[PDB]
Amino acid sequence: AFEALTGINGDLITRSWSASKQAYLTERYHKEEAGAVVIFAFQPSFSEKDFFDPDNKSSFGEIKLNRVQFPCMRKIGKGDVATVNEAFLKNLEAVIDPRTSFQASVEMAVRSRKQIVFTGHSSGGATAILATVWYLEKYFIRNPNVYLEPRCVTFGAPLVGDSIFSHALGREKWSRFFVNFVTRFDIVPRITLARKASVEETLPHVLAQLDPRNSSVQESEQRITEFYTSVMRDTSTVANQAVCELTGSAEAILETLSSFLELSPYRPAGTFVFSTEKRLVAVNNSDAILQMLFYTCQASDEQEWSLIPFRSIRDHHSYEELVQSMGMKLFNHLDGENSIESSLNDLGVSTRGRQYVQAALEEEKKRVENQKKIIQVIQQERFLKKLAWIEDEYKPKCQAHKNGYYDSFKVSNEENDFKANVKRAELAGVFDEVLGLLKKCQLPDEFEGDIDWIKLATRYRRLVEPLDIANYHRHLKNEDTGPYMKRGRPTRYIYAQRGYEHHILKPNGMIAEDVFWNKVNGLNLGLQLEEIQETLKNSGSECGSCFWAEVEELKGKPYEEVEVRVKTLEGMLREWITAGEVDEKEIFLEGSTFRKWWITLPKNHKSHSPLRDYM
């Protein structure tokens, strides 16, 4: 039952562990070729510099990822980029360096259709996790069918990413590829959950005792006990806050403490397998694993409490015993179990820790139920009829009047315009409600990646955003509130746009902004890039469904003042039409605001304009 869930057998685990140990003898990495499998093992390090970067001035050695090199490691709709440990990222950067032949070896294995496996022990396993993401970004994501599913297997690895990191891994359906083995008491997976000020004095000694090749520094009881107590105190604070950061009826005190609490951002990413003498327990839910990292590291009675720090040290070197006795241990998948009492009882988890784990699992199943309900909703006839009516009845009738459905909605002279407004409001309510669920993290990580949702939301945005723009300008909202692009655009459309752009752009490693600015510079405007960015600030040319918004912002202004934005809109129009973002049957109509304004442009522009032959 273990292999059908993790997709790896005991053979691969054993080879990965052997390579991770062999990596101790190299400078950067060791490559082990085992027929169809190529294993890259990274050398671990036990200096405090390699856990908290000296030049990092944050309380947990964290740093935001560069959106250019890891475009997927972010929230799509919200935009917030993921955060990782800076020391681990610098170490990965040092191993990806062309001079190391690491990348050449990766591509040699890729061309050979070998099963690629990334692995490492202790902090080396953390590097392996980041290397896997690099692989996922560079190779697997561009065409995930012919490329072979990789595996990342870590042993006692520190935590690497934050909650956004885990969310992004979940959305891409990548978490299933990661297995992190953690012996019950192992202190190392808990290390980065503590504030760096809490262990600044005791960390070098503990790292010296944990290093298997450093039998020089004499073991000190005091330092290890102080270290364990500091780590457990900060871990307990993080876990209890995570408990509160799920429930409710206390958002005020949580916001005040958020302004005054420094809690570690690092969260479990991927499947975790906890091991005892008699059990192997696999867990997928990151929140549940976070809780288990605390409640599995306590004493059963409190008189053994003086003994626990030494077992928490010794357990970091007990993964060898784990690997040899895998098949002799009882395995269960915690998320799929009908009863979790036995597993958590064997892990020494207290009653309260079990109730927190159960609550985290209940919350994830609630999110799954919400997604099933959303699919049932968006497939019902009463919902789809509104979009069908807008597309097949309102638009053709407005085209027949030779003014278009934007101008017809804007003047709203007929009953059909108020009926369209009613259905626009109902659709707005439904998509705002979905956005609300997303904002509260009450949908599955995969939600923003579901292609059925992206299809529907794109059809909705293309059909109805022109109508919300018309409604906006009908009520004179642009000077009072401000620019639509600046202060008026509903967030639901921004989420829809970003979800679609990510869906279509992520196989090519590029981000929407880069594609946009490359086309803008491709339009041969001649102006300085900084000047154009100044002109195109809050421009409507970043999304085809904001075409009419840009017209509103461009009409009335002198030609010299917004010439660049005009030429930008023209350069985007044909591709937008080809892509279906803008309907060609609408914008050229006799009574269209766009056509009426386009004729009033100077004749020198209209003469050499791409639209001369269309109006």
Partner: nanobody, 114 residues
């Protein structure tokens, strides 16, 4: 830089006892098990007996089982193998491998007279 150290070999008659030591100085002391193998010119380098430097549990191959014994000491990072009631077939060069072998040292001779 990193190497192994062996000591203990010699020559005993039948039904004797011999203790072999294995200094594990260098790199990675406890994350490995350690296991004695023996190679006799004319016989393959079969397995003798291994044990973990975290788990006292001793695995002993059947060819030498019941007569050999292992012991562990992480302080001096050393695995000891004591054997008794030896028989003429125990003549070989013994290597204390890293169970997932780390490297291959020099080993020690062990000879038993009839």
């Amino acid at each position: 830089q990193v190497q192994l150290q062996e000591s203990g070999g010699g020559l005993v008659q039948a039904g004797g006892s011999l203790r072999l030591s294995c200094t594990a100085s260098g790199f990675t002391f406890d994350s490995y098990h350690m296991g004695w193998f023996r190679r006799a010119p004319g016989k393959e380098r079969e397995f003798v007996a291994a044990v973990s430097r975290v788990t006292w549990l001793i695995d002993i191959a059947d060819s030498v089982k019941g007569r050999f014994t292992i012991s562990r000491d992480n302080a001096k990072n050393t695995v000891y193998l004591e054997m008794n009631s030896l028989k003429p077939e125990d003549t070989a060069q013994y290597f204390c491998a890293a169970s997932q072998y780390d490297y291959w040292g020099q080993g020690t001779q062990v000879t038993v007279s009839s």
